[PDB]
Design a protein around this ligand. Structure first.
Ligand SMILES: [Mg+2]
Ligand SMILES: [Mg+2]
Ligand SMILES: [Mg+2]
Ligand SMILES: [Mg+2]
Ligand SMILES: [Mg+2]
Ligand SMILES: [Mg+2]
Ligand SMILES: [Mg+2]
Ligand SMILES: [Mg+2]
Ligand SMILES: [Mg+2]
Ligand SMILES: [Mg+2]
Ligand SMILES: [Mg+2]
Ligand SMILES: [Mg+2]
Ligand SMILES: [Mg+2]
Ligand SMILES: [Mg+2]
Ligand SMILES: [Zn+2]
Ligand SMILES: [Zn+2]
Lengths: 247, 85, 106, 140, 98, 72, 61
RNA sequence: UUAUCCAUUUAUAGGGAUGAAUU
RNA sequence: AAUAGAUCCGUAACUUCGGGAAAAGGAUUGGCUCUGAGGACAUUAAUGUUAACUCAGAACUGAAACGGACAAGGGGAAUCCGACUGUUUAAUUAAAACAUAGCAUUGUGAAAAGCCACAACUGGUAUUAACACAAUGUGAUUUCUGCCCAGUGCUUUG
RNA sequence: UUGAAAAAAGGAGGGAACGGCUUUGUGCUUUGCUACUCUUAAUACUUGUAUG
RNA sequence: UUAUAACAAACCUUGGAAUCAAUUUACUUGGAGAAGAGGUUCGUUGAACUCAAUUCAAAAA
RNA sequence: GAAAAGUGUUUAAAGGGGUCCCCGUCUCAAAAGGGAAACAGGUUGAUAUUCCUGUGCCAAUAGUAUUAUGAGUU
């Protein structure tokens, strides 16, 4: 038959991200001598909306320790940060909302965001509006730290890995119903063209495993193996259980 | 004369949209549109500009907050913990 | 009424091609393309319009006299007066505080 | 008490002398049909002596250390008084005179003031903190 | 308890004595030497607070960091507007000076 | 186009060697009004003398190497 | 047309039958309100200037 | 760890204890 | 075909209390001649110069006529389907089809992950990071979603 | 849904550098003298024919 | 830079506001300084305004 | 990759600005985005903000030497 919707996506044509209006990538500071041995202070000069995001960014300006000039970075804004607030980043930084510290230097229970999964990664985990990771332990041999991601998953990362004390701004955005179709239209219009979503069951056979039939029904189990191929991964991929989640 | 009894701010939506959904929107709308107390000037002038941005008409200071309320409880808790530490 | 028409190649109602209907000595009503209103040069800090500087487009700003581009303070036509004052205060007060801190330490 | 004493150093906050430091000479504090504001009357430095290095030759050093002064009457609400006071190091009455502000040869007076400042800078004394502060161009 | 005491003192001052509230007036008072003690709200904007402190130092005056917000400082006086910083220029029966 | 009011300034302009042409116009006013135009390389300066005799005198004064245009 | 205008001025043509737009379209309620308020406010301003009214009274009114 | 692979930046200090900041 | 514009009246069942609703159903409307209501100024509370157009009311009038042409809803009582605005078979199908918000499920903690693309190297999602992205199903709300894992799937331990 | 970018231009911070001529020694240093540094416009002259 | 005048703003000086005030069609704003009194600027506008000049007569430097 | 082609910093010794340092893929892509500066009258059988008359505006304008124009210094 034909190429399914999903398959089309990968070539990225009309299916690339809508990148034009975005302010730029959100990234932590480069991991310089400063950040590794002491702290460096910056100022959030403005907090600003990024289109495809649900969380505002903070433009924070730093002084280059190696060259005369100010340099502007793009952080994700933690809740409670404000314009003209001072941000401190480094091994020997103090533990306040907004600052950026190695996970090793925060007592357990601390709440962090924009976490690097390896050191230097410029921040990778807990970025979406509302989310945070919690420090749940530091190994007695040191070196690693144990964190709990918004999913529930526990992961062990390097203590040298950086993070930002506090929670990401714009929380509870998902609490409000997207009452109208058009408001969702507007939302995805700034991400990528994954809206309208036709049901495979509403398609013809050429178009989808689910396609066709006199009655509009799936016709076969809709749980597909991990070891399926491109046009078979169409329903509930690799589903370990199904039905209303009781656990 | 007070126009709506239970509807309030959701009078713009009218008859359409589930009533339950409208009720929820109402709370959220209220949260959004209330002039919050600015923790700098003191004047209740902080209003929502974007999703997580809250600007004051007094200071022009943009404070990062929650999507609908200026402070989500979790964030407050986190702050408190930090303070205690 | 006397009907008019565009004369400057661009025949679309764009922000740059905004038009003012003008009467001529010949009696004919003619079209004149209005030069766009430039945004007022605003402060480096609070982004509020700076006085003393004429709001002119990058083209018109080059021909204009230096008096229409500059204010005679320190940071001049880049920072409003209040902000300048604030900066000055910061420079002094902070410095003073530093000294005090040093004294305390010693 | 009365913070603005004749001789104390102050930082101008407003006008063409934006962030300049100066010494007040005669405080008036009397509103009139003329000046409906308490005003200070101040002699200050507009152009500070540029940084100098030991290796440099004497004439060039001297040139570097030339100070361009100014004398201005200014509303007290526009000056920040400092803890630093130069009552001793400067014979203040000699610097600025009320009558001379009105006088034609104001430029000459200014020049004289500048010269005096330069001289003071040259001969430190023992060494006052206030004078050092005055010397150091304010960075903002 | 301390806060309560402070409030009481403020009230007393209001009842009997001479005070003036708000930045510029306070500054003027300080300049004069008329100020006996200044009280600064928690939320008073940093630079201005610093300036006030400096002024106080210059006049060998007390600075009193009022524990509560701008709004409170105002509610603390008989006023329905926020105050920020005030200057006692004459204490009545009140003790706050000592 | 420029208007002139200081007679002296006008005279000075006239004295200046980039002034090739002059114009003198007569207008029935709503008496005889007279416009004195000087045509410089860059600008055309014009003076309105309400008083005929004065205008005449000024014209007389004007250098006789000027290429005077009597418009009406 | 001039005659018609004259008639209208004397109130002749105007009448329920000669009306096609709603009352608001005929003469906008909002505009009327604006007029009225501005008239009143101007008067108030005048009165206070004359000292004929005291500020407190003015404000309440 | 040297092959290899991944990341990071201008490949920018060997390890430990709401101003300014340059010749 | 009838209905229709506007002003004044009058407005039910039911309802998610927002609507229904212009509900239904009435009445009035021309022309002429008047009357009242609504400003701006500027003189000194009276006196002036003067501006729109809009209201409201009263006479008289006519072959009882008047939104005189033009323009301009038929309405109601119900039942079935879809909630709704939207989209679609260009040239036989405009829908009860699709979408939709909402609900639910599943996978994935990352450059050795998820889903997809590419002959290959490389790439997209991704200037992304679980309030995310990908993949399904159902289709606002209200009220609920029983039982069955033998069969076929998917999946977990070795 | 927060609603382009750059060319180009401007402002500010910052304080590098510093008058001309003549003589002497190896651009630099020393000595003596006082109209100098700018800036428009015009003009004259060489250099390829110096306004579109 | 058309000269000015007028006006919506923004800012400055003075002034110190509960008997809350100023204020818009709307709300907005005010001890982080309101009203009021005097100003400055940008922007509209592009001869408005006595704008300019002239006619002379009186008062200062 | 057999090539044709497919990718565009993934392990580059990738021209400019200052007085050796500091920057830096190139190039095309808008006759509705950005952008140096023009208007009026007149004129032809047919062109006109393009010709003519008049009035302007914008960008250039090497070096040396004179000149005038005013600044600043002494
Ligand atoms: Mg869906
Ligand atoms: Mg669907
Ligand atoms: Mg089908
Ligand atoms: Mg199939
Ligand atoms: Mg079918
Ligand atoms: Mg179905
Ligand atoms: Mg209304
Ligand atoms: Mg439908
Ligand atoms: Mg068809
Ligand atoms: Mg459907
Ligand atoms: Mg349903
Ligand atoms: Mg079931
Ligand atoms: Mg091109
Ligand atoms: Mg164009
Ligand atoms: Zn605020
Ligand atoms: Zn500012």
């Amino acid at each position: 038959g034909r190429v399914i919707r999903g398959q089309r996506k990968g070539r990225g044509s009309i299916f690339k991200s809508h990148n034009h209006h975005r302010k730029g990538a959100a990234k932590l500071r480069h991991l310089d001598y400063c950040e590794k041995k002491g702290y460096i202070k910056g100022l959030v000069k403005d907090i600003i909306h990024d289109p495809g995001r649900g969380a505002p960014l903070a433009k924070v300006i730093f002084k280059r320790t190696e060259k005369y000039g100010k340099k502007e970075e793009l952080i994700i804004a933690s809740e409670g940060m404000f314009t003209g607030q001072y941000i401190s980043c480094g091994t020997k930084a103090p533990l306040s909302v907004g600052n950026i510290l190695p996970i090793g230097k925060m007592p357990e229970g601390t709440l962090i965001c924009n976490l690097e999964h390896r050191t230097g990664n410029r921040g990778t985990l807990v970025k979406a509006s509302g989310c945070y990771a919690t420090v749940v332990g530091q190994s007695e041999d040191g070196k690693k730290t144990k964190v709990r991601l918004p999913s529930g998953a526990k992961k062990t990362i390097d203590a040298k890995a950086r993070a930002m004390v506090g929670v990401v701004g714009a929380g509870g955005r998902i609490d409000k119903p997207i009452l109208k179709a058009g408001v969702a239209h507007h939302k995805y219009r700034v991400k990528r063209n994954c809206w309208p979503k036709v049901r495979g069951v509403a398609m013809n056979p050429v178009e989808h495993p689910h396609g066709g039939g006199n009655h509009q029904h799936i016709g076969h189990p809709s749980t597909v193996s991990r070891s399926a191929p491109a046009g078979q991964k169409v329903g509930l991929i690799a589903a370990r259980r199904t039905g209303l989640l009781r656990g | 004369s007070r126009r709506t009894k239970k509807v309030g701010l959701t009078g713009k939506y009218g008859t359409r949209y589930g009533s339950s959904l409208r009720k929820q929107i109402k709370k959220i709308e209220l949260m959004q549109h209330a002039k919050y107390l600015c923790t700098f000037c003191g004047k209740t002038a902080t209003k929502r500009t974007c999703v997580g941005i809250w600007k004051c008409k007094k200071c022009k200071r943009k404070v990062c907050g929650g999507a609908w309320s200026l402070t989500t409880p979790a964030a407050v808790a986190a702050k408190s913990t930090i303070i205690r530490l | 009424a006397q009907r008019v028409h565009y004369r400057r190649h661009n025949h679309y109602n764009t922000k740059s091609n905004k038009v003012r209907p003008v009467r001529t000595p010949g009696g004919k009503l003619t079209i004149h393309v209005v030069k766009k209103k430039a945004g007022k040069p605003k402060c480096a800090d609070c982004k509020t319009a700076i006085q003393g500087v004429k709001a002119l487009r990058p083209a018109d700003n080059y021909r204009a006299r230096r008096k229409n581009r500059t204010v005679a303070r320190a940071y001049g036509g880049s920072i409003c007066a209040r902000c300048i004052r604030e900066r000055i205060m910061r420079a002094f007060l902070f410095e003073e505080q530093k000294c005090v801190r040093q004294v305390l330490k010693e | 008490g009365k913070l603005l004493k004749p001789g104390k150093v102050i930082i101008i906050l407003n006008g063409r002398r934006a962030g300049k430091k100066a010494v007040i000479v005669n405080t008036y504090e009397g509103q009139t049909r003329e000046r409906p504001y308490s005003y200070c009357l101040v002699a200050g430095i507009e152009k500070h002596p540029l940084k100098v290095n030991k290796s440099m030759t004497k004439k060039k050093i001297v040139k570097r250390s030339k100070v361009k002064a100014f004398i201005k009457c200014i509303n007290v609400n526009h000056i920040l008084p400092t803890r630093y006071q130069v009552a001793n190091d400067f014979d203040i009455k000699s610097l600025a005179s009320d009558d001379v502000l009105k006088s034609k040869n104001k430029k000459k007076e200014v020049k004289k003031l500048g010269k005096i400042f330069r001289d003071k800078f040259l001969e430190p004394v023992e060494v006052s903190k206030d004078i050092s502060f005055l010397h150091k161009k304010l960075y903002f | 308890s301390a806060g309560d005491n402070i409030n009481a003192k403020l009230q007393l001052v209001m009842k009997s004595g001479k005070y003036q509230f708000g930045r510029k007036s306070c500054l003027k008072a300080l300049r004069t030497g008329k100020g006996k003690l200044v009280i600064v709200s928690s939320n008073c904007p940093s630079i201005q607070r610093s300036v006030i402190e400096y002024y106080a130092m210059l006049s060998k005056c007390g600075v009193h960091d009022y524990h509560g917000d701008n709004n409170d400082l105002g509610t603390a006086c008989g006023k329905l507007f926020r105050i920020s910083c005030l200057v006692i220029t004459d204490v009545g029966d009140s003790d706050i000076i000592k | 186009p420029k208007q002139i009011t200081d007679i002296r300034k006008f005279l000075k302009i006239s004295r200046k060697p980039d002034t090739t042409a002059v114009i003198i116009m007569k207008k029935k006013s709503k008496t005889v009004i007279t416009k004195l135009k000087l045509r410089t390389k860059k600008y055309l300066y014009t003076m309105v003398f309400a008083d005929r005799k004065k205008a005449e005198r000024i014209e007389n004064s004007l250098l006789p190497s000027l290429k005077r245009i009597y418009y009406p | 047309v001039r005659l018609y205008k004259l008639a209208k001025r004397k109130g002749r043509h105007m009448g329920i039958g000669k009306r096609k737009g709603t009352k608001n379209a005929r003469t906008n309620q909002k505009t009327l309100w604006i007029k009225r308020q501005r008239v009143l406010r101007r008067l108030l301003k005048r009165l206070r200037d004359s000292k004929k009214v005291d500020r407190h009274l003015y404000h309440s009114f």
